[PDB]
Amino acid sequence: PVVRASNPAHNGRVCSTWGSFHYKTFDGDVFRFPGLCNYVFSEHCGAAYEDFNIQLRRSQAPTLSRVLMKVDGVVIQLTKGSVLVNGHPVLLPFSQSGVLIQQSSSYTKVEARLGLVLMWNHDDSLLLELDTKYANKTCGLCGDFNGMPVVSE
Amino acid sequence: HAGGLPQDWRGPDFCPQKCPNNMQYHECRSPCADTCSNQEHSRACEDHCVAGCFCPEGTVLDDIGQTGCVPVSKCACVYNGAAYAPGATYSTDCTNCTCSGGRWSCQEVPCPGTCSVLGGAHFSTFDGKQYTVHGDCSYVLTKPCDSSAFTVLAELRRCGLTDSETCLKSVTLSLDGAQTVVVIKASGEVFLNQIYTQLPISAANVTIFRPSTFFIIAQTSLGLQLNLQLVPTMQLFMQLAPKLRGQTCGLCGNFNSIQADDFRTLSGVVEATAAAFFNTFKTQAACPNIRNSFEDPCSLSVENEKYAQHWCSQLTDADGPFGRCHAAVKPGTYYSNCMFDTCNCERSEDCLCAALSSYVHACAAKGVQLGGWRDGVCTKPMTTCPKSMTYHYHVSTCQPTCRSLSEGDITCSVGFIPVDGCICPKGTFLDDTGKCVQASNCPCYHRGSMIPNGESVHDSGAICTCTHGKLSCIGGQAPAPVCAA
Amino acid sequence: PMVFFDCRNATPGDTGAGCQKSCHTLDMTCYSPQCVPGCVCPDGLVADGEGGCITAEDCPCVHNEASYRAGQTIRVGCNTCTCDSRMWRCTDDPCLATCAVYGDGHYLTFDGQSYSFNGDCEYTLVQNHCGGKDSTQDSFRVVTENVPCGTTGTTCSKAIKIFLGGFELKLSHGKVEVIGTQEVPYTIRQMGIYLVVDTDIGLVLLWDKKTSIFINLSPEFKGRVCGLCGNFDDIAVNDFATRSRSVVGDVLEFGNSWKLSPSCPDALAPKDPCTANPFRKSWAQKQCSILHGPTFAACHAHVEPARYYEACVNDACACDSGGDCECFCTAVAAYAQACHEVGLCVSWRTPSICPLFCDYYNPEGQCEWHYQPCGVPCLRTCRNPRGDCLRDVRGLEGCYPKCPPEAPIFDEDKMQCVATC
Numbered sequence A: 001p002v003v004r005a006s007n008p009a010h011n012g013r014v015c016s017t018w019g020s021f022h023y024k025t026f027d028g029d030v031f032r033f034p035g036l037c038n039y040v041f042s043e044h045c046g047a048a049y050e051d052f053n054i055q056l057r058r059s060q061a062p063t064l065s066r067v068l069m070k071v072d073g074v075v076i077q078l079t080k081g082s083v084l085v086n087g088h089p090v091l092l093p094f095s096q097s098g099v100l101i102q103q104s105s106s107y108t109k110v111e112a113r114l115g116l117v118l119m120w121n122h123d124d125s126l127l128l129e130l131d132t133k134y135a136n137k138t139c140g141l142c143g144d145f146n147g148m149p150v151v152s153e
Numbered sequence B: 001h002a003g004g005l006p007q008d009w010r011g012p013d014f015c016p017q018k019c020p021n022n023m024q025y026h027e028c029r030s031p032c033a034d035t036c037s038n039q040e041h042s043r044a045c046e047d048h049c050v051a052g053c054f055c056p057e058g059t060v061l062d063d064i065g066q067t068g069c070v071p072v073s074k075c076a077c078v079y080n081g082a083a084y085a086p087g088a089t090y091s092t093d094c095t096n097c098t099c100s101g102g103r104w105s106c107q108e109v110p111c112p113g114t115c116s117v118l119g120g121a122h123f124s125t126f127d128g129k130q131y132t133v134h135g136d137c138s139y140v141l142t143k144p145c146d147s148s149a150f151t152v153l154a155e156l157r158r159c160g161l162t163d164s165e166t167c168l169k170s171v172t173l174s175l176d177g178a179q180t181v182v183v184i185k186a187s188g189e190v191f192l193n194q195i196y197t198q199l200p201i202s203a204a205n206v207t208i209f210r211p212s213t214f215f216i217i218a219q220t221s222l223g224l225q226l227n228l229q230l231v232p233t234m235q236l237f238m239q240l241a242p243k244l245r246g247q248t249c250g251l252c253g254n255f256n257s258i259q260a261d262d263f264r265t266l267s268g269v270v271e272a273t274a275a276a277f278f279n280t281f282k283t284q285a286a287c288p289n290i291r292n293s294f295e296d297p298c299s300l301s302v303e304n305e306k307y308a309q310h311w312c313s314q315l316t317d318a319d320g321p322f323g324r325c326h327a328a329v330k331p332g333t334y335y336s337n338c339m340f341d342t343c344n345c346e347r348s349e350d351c352l353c354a355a356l357s358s359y360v361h362a363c364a365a366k367g368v369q370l371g372g373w374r375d376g377v378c379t380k381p382m383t384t385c386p387k388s389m390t391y392h393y394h395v396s397t398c399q400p401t402c403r404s405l406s407e408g409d410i411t412c413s414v415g416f417i418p419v420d421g422c423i424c425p426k427g428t429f430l431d432d433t434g435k436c437v438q439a440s441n442c443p444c445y446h447r448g449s450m451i452p453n454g455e456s457v458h459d460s461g462a463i464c465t466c467t468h469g470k471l472s473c474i475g476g477q478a479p480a481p482v483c484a485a
Numbered sequence C: 001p002m003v004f005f006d007c008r009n010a011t012p013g014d015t016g017a018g019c020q021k022s023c024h025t026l027d028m029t030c031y032s033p034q035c036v037p038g039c040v041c042p043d044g045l046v047a048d049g050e051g052g053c054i055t056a057e058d059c060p061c062v063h064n065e066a067s068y069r070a071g072q073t074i075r076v077g078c079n080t081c082t083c084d085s086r087m088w089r090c091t092d093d094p095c096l097a098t099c100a101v102y103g104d105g106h107y108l109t110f111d112g113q114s115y116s117f118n119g120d121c122e123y124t125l126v127q128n129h130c131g132g133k134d135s136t137q138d139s140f141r142v143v144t145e146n147v148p149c150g151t152t153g154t155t156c157s158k159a160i161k162i163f164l165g166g167f168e169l170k171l172s173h174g175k176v177e178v179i180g181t182q183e184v185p186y187t188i189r190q191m192g193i194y195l196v197v198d199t200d201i202g203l204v205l206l207w208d209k210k211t212s213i214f215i216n217l218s219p220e221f222k223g224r225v226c227g228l229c230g231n232f233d234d235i236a237v238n239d240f241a242t243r244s245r246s247v248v249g250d251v252l253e254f255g256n257s258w259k260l261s262p263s264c265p266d267a268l269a270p271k272d273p274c275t276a277n278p279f280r281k282s283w284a285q286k287q288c289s290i291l292h293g294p295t296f297a298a299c300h301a302h303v304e305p306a307r308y309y310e311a312c313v314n315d316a317c318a319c320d321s322g323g324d325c326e327c328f329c330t331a332v333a334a335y336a337q338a339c340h341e342v343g344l345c346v347s348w349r350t351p352s353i354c355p356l357f358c359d360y361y362n363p364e365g366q367c368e369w370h371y372q373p374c375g376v377p378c379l380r381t382c383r384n385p386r387g388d389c390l391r392d393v394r395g396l397e398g399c400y401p402k403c404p405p406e407a408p409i410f411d412e413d414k415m416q417c418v419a420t421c
């Protein structure tokens, strides 16, 4: 299967949350939801086997307290000043099972070779970039990823 | 993420961002940051520009020292896990490299080549190619293709019930169109021109000596050197001068730094298997054609495999007697040779000791000494030399003799790879009867003739008596005879 | 006419059978110093290996445990060698070199340096513009993307990225993505089990779509490339040149120096798979013994199976996280492709050993697709209506269509046999 690409604008593959409970879905729908509970940021519900499952939690300033990621059997818990992999604290950079977690001067990046990139920045913004193979197969606060903003979300 | 190029909008008071060291915060720069190790990472980048801390233009990150962003000219270099400095140099046996701009600039230097026949079946050519054929004939090891100035032959013969137990029984060095033939047997006997001689020999263009009871070294004036280990089994190490690169050809390759053409026969094509190329260097028609099978001797015996694994794994043990050499010589091939030889040959201890000694000799050639490696195994050869001889792990000099004391010059090649074995103890000289005696017991010599103690000689009207190993002369001395016109 | 000569009446200076040569002893110099008993041909005659005696110039040429008469033709690489008076006359045409990466990080460079490296990051397989960075031609870069495959520390490839000109190809899963940005300088062709990417600069890539890549580079790139595939200068020892342009002895350092991202953690030496997983070892040794049995017996004289068997056993021992059959099939198919490249059409896939579902490609009420060990080099298709074959790729085994005379042109886009495109 040969798939061509020429347009470099790929805003449809990016979902993020920032500021005062501002959310942008993969389809471009920007809304505000001041929820402080534990919510599903994005998960692969379009297949019998789930490739990824990312959840985020907020605490009160709208700070991000916990990010839970299930990536092909790898459990990553990101908290302020702590990174846990399968319940064990790790030292960054940390590469395991096709998942690379690295901290920079402004962000914590988790890259999964199945095609996802998660960024937890220091201005309290969580940005997720997904491979185009996950289109029309996701659910959560980031939408169903089908290129249409309102329908199916 | 839209393919745009945002311009910096922050400031000291408008959303200020801090960066480590001298890095600056930018809204759109390539995430592939150039470092000292990879100074062209930005050019080879597939991602779009991002926002973050980046080095100022003209500088790259210092990942080696973690000292912030440094200029390219100030980047260090890393070799063998040790960080160097701009302008620092290192050298190998074959090259000399210097650090500059974070990159190594290397110049080639003259470099002798080494061929090795170990265990009677394991061959390592001049270009580093390794193979294993169990021959049953006399084979041409090294020889110039267009001449016959020198020629080295090896007598690899089946020395067991099976066809995969090969012993090196003799080595033949032929010089000047077979005008000087030296045959060195596995029993230590040396035959010069079909005459059983006694070492050392200074023949035409060749000098052969015995640095110890374990080794025989033959050095020619054509740039060829032979080290022959006789204890416990006969093994060969040939060293060739760089002047013969690309000119020799035999079982040791053509010495042209290419491993691909080391299996090229005299026909002109490169063979695919070691056995096919090996069988083309036979010297006699009746010798069998060796076909390489895929046997695994260690699988044929539980006890043999256990013994081989227990005693040969010390080669690859980083914290063992041979651990100080893993950086110089890779022990994987030596470990494989040890396992195969120990599991295959009937005298397992002999083959294990041969493999360990071959690795030790390679390390000594690289300049690493592993003295005290015979504790636990291979203890027997340390307690087998004659009465007046004692063992030594490092023998980098030549055996002193009474004739060396008298004449003043010892027949030796001066410079050779250090060996091990039983030699005369320090301060003790080897007498002509194979005995180490003190300087007070070494006989006198006049005109190449032994003068027994208490005897006298007459020369130019002067009487010289041999007392206490010294040839004193009555009347003081005989300074200079003068012949009138 | 051979007569047994014995050394009973051995006059001085008489070798006897000690200097009797044969068609296999290519060195005609007499080295024996003393008499040796044995069969001797009449004076001036050498043995032909069948009991007769012939002249030295009439001895047949020997190559890979085979005998060829005068005038016979063999093919080595791209050249042709003709036997003539015991010698081989070969043309001197330079041609491509193949870098092969497969399994749990088993690498064979352009110059023939074989090694094993287990790196978790993305690594530059090959690239030009290394020294000086200007040279000539257009810059290309083939980069491998790796992922852990097992629990012993082994790592195998997942995706292959080819950056040519302003265009990028990503071979991942089983598909190709043209990331892109002039005309596309790529030709993607599915032949057998292989996907072939051909470029107009002289670069060919064979991809078995799971873990195996074979990069064929034209001789015009000799000494102008670098990466994990060496530098292509016919010397194998210096292929372990790090990104700092220094040849090292440690494979780990050389491999780790070629990672794309400097921030990626450096790889460590993995555990021995058959030692860390002994309960699998027997199975491995029972499965990879196909490489030593009668299945590949015809190829043992042309490709040495030692390293392939070692890689097979190690991969089978280390394939402990799921998918042993894929590991075993890739390891055996590496040796199968090596055999096919030198003109040996060996059939090894049985319904129990790495089966191929050719009938999956048969349309309703049709039977055309058949397994080919050496493949069909020139098969008629829409892009090749005249039925031409450019060589440069040999023995790409797999399912190939056998179009009937009614519809003799194979349309790949329609994947069907048609009369005209």
Ligand SMILES: [Ca+2]
Residues within 6 Å of the ligand: B127, B253, B254, B255, B256, B257, B258, B259, B260, B261, B262
């Ligand atoms: Ca060479």
Ligand SMILES: [Ca+2]
Residues within 6 Å of the ligand: C111, C230, C231, C232, C233, C234, C235, C236, C237, C238, C239
């Ligand atoms: Ca090279």
